[PDB]
Structures are given as structure tokens and as C-alpha cells.
């Protein structure tokens, strides 16, 4: 009378560690087994299963998503508000994604977005982390003229740049609420190529188009390709999120990594963006409800969470977990974690995000401003009614 449950993982960089933590939990609960299910196109495979009443027992679902918000409200996930382990979460970080004042997702860690950069290279080239858009332009051009490739872009994998272009409007208007007031809660067809906002977005994106700025053959490079380039010193920087660090450390790079926040028009305006990263919610219809809380309770134990945080490094929201000094790789992208400088993903209030990813990458692969401005309105007009 052993009972198997599914945990529906969407965090791929971290599968080998999550499988280990799972074996340690099956070893201490010898009457429980746990399927770790990592599928392709998880976002969608999960959307199918949920409409079809087949929700996996524990699900890794990102807590700012519409899907979560909708499904929470339609009773698909258990109310966790009045669980004990939930007390081990801090920064009122469960309640930052409450739905009708009820918590439905334990957000263990929270991700962030920024540029990764080779510290050793930058040292060798007399170059410094940038603090204005202008300095950042001039950075990229200074690397080109010193014979090296500034950026590794994953031109097949449009999502890697979602956080970038968000941060572009974000720093461009003052923050998240303001960006969405520009893009989303404005009139239909509002977004024009002439808006000063729109002109800054394009200034910030255009940094990724500076002549000589991307690696040979980037247009078909994926995540892992770019991760390999950065790791080898083939490229000096890559815009991406805290989740990549694990994959970057795997390839055993021969230089110390830094990160930085994408900057504003002026000094001190920089931002990062992100939300719960390792974040779990429990089926309201799981056949085995007690086992599912046992898995989740386990993940909150600070000595278990340390095993995970030691491989992944995204900053964590659980009590008792030694965080790293400011000499960490992620030190500069996650400095401001859990402050009013860590915006929640803009797509919180959107109906989807694929078409945003796409139009971002398309601009970097085409350079077409009116086309991108048009594409922005084509994406947001369905939402404004």
C-alpha cells in the first residue's frame, strides 16, 4: 500500500538536484513515491491537464501567472493559508500572491533578471559595470573595438529576453505599475512610435543591435548554446535570469562571474524583475492529500532547502537558509531582492506572454520599429476590452 504522487516540475536547470532531494524524501517516507515529471512545453501540457481535470498532485507553477490566478479562483489548488510549514516562508511572500486573501502557492525562491558578465575579462579590458543606458551603449561599443564579442543572444529562444524588454519599459517609465499603465491599461492603439516612452524602449533594445554586438550565428542559437558560449569566454555578457547560474556553473568556467542590473536613464535608476521561482501549489483534487503536504513540508525544512539553494543560488524566502556573501555570482542582480526595486513580472495583468517574447526577439533580429510598435498594439488590444 505504497502511494505514488506526481510533482510537475517546470524547473529544468535544477532537475538533477530536485531528483536527489526527492530520493532523500522517499528514503525517509518509505510508504511514499514521487514521480518527477519534466516534459517539453510544460506551460501548455499543464494547461491541457488542468482543463481535463488531471492535475498533477504537486505542481511547480509560477505564482504571478494568470493561470495560477484563474485556477486558484476556480478551486483547482488547495488553500494553504492555514498550514504550519507556511510560517517558514518569510517576507510575507506567500501573501504577495494571495488570491481573495487566500494563499495557494508556496513560493520557496524568487528569481531576478540582469546581465551576467565575465569579471576577469572586464578587469583585463579596463571596463566597468554600467549605470546609465548611455554608459551601457558605450560599454558594448568599447568591447567591440577591443576585438571581443559583447553579447551571447539565444535567437531561437525568445523568452530569454522577456525580462530585458520588460525592464526596458520598466526603467523607462519609473517601475512596473507605470509600464503597464503605458502598455496595458491605456487606450486601444495608444502605443505610438513617437511617444518618448517608446523612444527609450527602443534606445534600450537598440543596445542589443549595436554593430558587432552578438556572437557568430546567434539567430539560431538556443539557451544552452549561449550558456556554453558565456561559460567559455566566447562572449563577455549574456542577459538572462538568476535561473541560468546553475547551468553556467555546470560548464565549469575559468573566470569569476558577475552580474548587474539593467540601468536607467540616470545613475540609481536600475531595476530587476521576477517572481516566485521554485514555487509549488497542491491539487485540490489529489487522491493523496496528506502525502502532498508532506512533500511540500519537506521542501521548507531549512536543511533541505540549503541543499537546493547551494546548487541553484536564486535568492530564497525560507527561514534558516544561509545566504551567500556579496562575492557571489548573483550578488548584483539580487542585491535588491524583495525591495520595491524587484518588480513582479509585468504579465501578471496580461492574458499571455508568448507574443511579447516574439516581438522582442523579432526586433533584435530585424530592427523594425514601426513593425514592433504595430506588434505591441496587436498583442495588447484584445486585452483592453
Ligand X SMILES: OC[C@H]1O[C@H](OC[C@H]2O[C@H](O[C@]3(CO)O[C@H](CO)[C@@H](O)[C@@H]3O)[C@H](O)[C@@H](O)[C@@H]2O)[C@H](O)[C@@H](O)[C@H]1O
269 makes contact, choosing from ligand X, Cl ion, none, with CB < 5 to 8 Å by partner type, with: none
165 makes contact, choosing from ligand X, Cl ion, none, with CB < 5 to 8 Å by partner type, with: none
200 makes contact, choosing from Cl ion, ligand X, none, with CB < 5 to 8 Å by partner type, with: none
Of 118-126, 158-166, 262-270, 289-297, the segment contacting ligand X by CB under 6 A is 158-166
42 makes contact, choosing from ligand X, Cl ion, none, with CB < 5 to 8 Å by partner type, with: ligand X
Query: Mask of contacts with ligand X, 13-42, x by CB under 6 A?
Result: x----------------------------x
Residues 338-367 that bind Cl ion (CB under 5 A): 352-354
Residues 234-273 that bind ligand X (CB under 6 A): 241, 243
The residue (of 65 and 238) whose beta carbon lies closer to ligand X is 65
- The nearest distance, CB 138 to ligand X, in angstroms, is 27
- The nearest distance, CB 255 to Cl ion, in angstroms, is 36
Residues 284-313 that bind ligand X (CB under 6 A): none
**Among 62, 93, 260, 309, interactor with ligand X by CB under 6 A:** 62
10 makes contact, choosing from Cl ion, ligand X, none, with CB < 5 to 8 Å by partner type, with: ligand X
- The nearest distance, CB 350 to Cl ion, in angstroms, is 9
Using rule CB under 6 A, residue 111 touches ligand X: yes
The residue (of 97 and 122) whose beta carbon lies closer to ligand X is 97
Residue 31, CA distances (Å) to 36, 50, 294, 345 in order: 17, 27, 12, 39
Of 5-13, 97-105, 179-187, 191-199, the segment contacting ligand X by CB under 6 A is 5-13
354 makes contact, choosing from Cl ion, ligand X, none, with CB < 5 to 8 Å by partner type, with: Cl ion
- The nearest distance, CB 94 to ligand X, in angstroms, is 16
The pairing of strands 272-273 and 58-60 is unpaired
3-state secondary structure the chain: CCEEEEEECCCCCCHHHHHHHHHHHHHHCCCEEEEEECCCCHHHHHHHHHHCCCCCCEEECCCCCHHHHHHHHCCCECCCCCCCHHHHECCCCCHHHCCCCCCCCEECEECCEEEEEEHHHHHHCCCCCCCEHHHHHHHHHHHHHCCCCCECCCCCCHHHHHHHHHHHHHHHHCCHHHHHHHHCCCCCCCCCCCCHHHHHHHHHHHHHHCCCCECCCHHHCCHHHHHHHHHHCCCCEEEEECCHHHHHHHCCCCCCEEEECECECCCCCCEEECCECCEEEEECCCCCHHHHHHHHHHHHCHHHHHHHHHHHCCCECECCCCCCCCCCHHHHCCCCCCCCCEECCHHHHCCCCHHHHHHHHHHHHHCCHHHHHHHHHHHHCCCCC
The residue (of 10 and 272) whose beta carbon lies closer to ligand X is 10
**Among 5, 7, 11, 200, interactor with ligand X by CB under 6 A:** 11
Residues lying near ligand X in the complex (CB under 6 A): 10-13, 42-43, 62, 65, 111, 159, 162-163, 241, 243, 275, 277, 345, 347, 353
Amino acid at each position: 500500500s505504497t502511494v505514488t504522487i506526481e510533482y510537475f516540475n517546470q524547473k529544468k536547470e535544477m532537475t538533477k538536484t530536485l531528483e536527489e532531494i526527492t530520493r532523500d524524501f522517499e528514503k525517509e517516507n518509505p510508504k511514499i513515491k514521487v514521480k518527477v515529471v519534466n516534459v517539453p512545453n510544460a506551460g501548455e501540457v499543464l494547461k491541457t491537464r488542468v482543463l481535463a481535470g488531471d492535475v498533477p498532485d504537486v505542481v511547480n507553477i509560477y505564482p504571478q501567472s494568470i493561470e495560477l490566478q484563474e485556477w486558484a479562483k476556480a478551486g483547482v489548488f488547495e488553500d494553504l493559508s492555514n498550514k504550519d510549514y507556511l510560517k517558514r516562508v518569510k517576507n510575507g511572500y506567500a501573501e504577495k500572491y494571495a488570491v481573495n486573501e487566500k494563499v495557494y502557492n508556496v513560493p520557496f525562491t524568487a528569481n531576478a533578471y540582469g546581465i551576467y558578465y565575465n569579471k576577469d575579462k572586464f578587469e583585463e579590458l579596463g571596463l566597468k559595470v554600467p549605470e546609465t543606458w548611455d554608459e551601457f551603449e558605450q560599454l558594448v561599443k568599447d568591447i567591440v573595438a577591443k576585438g571581443q564579442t559583447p553579447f551571447g543572444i539565444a535567437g531561437a529562444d525568445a523568452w530569454t529576453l522577456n525580462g530585458y524588454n520588460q525592464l526596458a519599459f520598466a526603467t523607462a517609465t519609473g517601475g512596473g505599475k507605470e509600464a503597464n499603465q503605458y502598455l496595458r491599461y491605456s487606450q486601444p492603439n495608444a502605443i505610438k512610435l513617437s511617444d518618448p516612452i517608446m523612444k527609450d524602449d527602443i534606445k534600450v533594445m537598440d543596445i542589443l543591435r549595436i554593430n558587432g554586438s552578438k556572437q557568430k550565428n546567434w539567430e539560431g542559437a538556443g539557451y544552452t548554446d549561449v550558456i556554453g558560449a558565456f561559460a567559455r569566454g566566447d562572449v563577455l555578457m549574456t542577459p538572462n535570469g538568476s535561473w541560468a547560474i546553475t547551468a553556467i556553473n555546470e560548464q565549469k568556467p575559468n573566470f569569476k562571474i558577475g552580474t548587474f542590473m539593467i540601468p536607467g536613464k540616470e545613475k540609481g535608476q536600475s531595476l530587476t524583475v521576477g517572481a516566485g521561482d521554485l514555487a509549488w501549489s497542491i491539487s485540490a483534487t489529489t487522491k493523496h492529500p496528506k502525502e502532498a503536504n508532506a512533500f511540500v513540508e519537506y521542501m521548507t525544512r531549512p536543511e533541505v532547502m540549503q541543499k537546493y539553494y547551494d546548487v541553484d543560488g536564486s535568492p530564497t524566502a525560507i527561514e534558516g537558509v544561509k545566504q551567500a556573501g556579496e562575492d557571489s555570482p548573483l550578488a548584483g542582480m539580487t542585491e535588491y531582492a524583495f525591495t520595491d526595486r524587484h518588480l513582479v513580472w509585468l504579465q501578471q495583468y496580461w492574458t499571455s506572454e508568448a507574443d511579447f517574447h516574439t516581438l522582442t526577439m523579432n526586433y533584435v533580429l530585424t530592427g523594425d520599429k514601426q513593425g514592433m510598435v504595430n506588434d505591441l498594439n496587436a498583442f495588447f488590444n484584445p486585452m483592453k476590452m
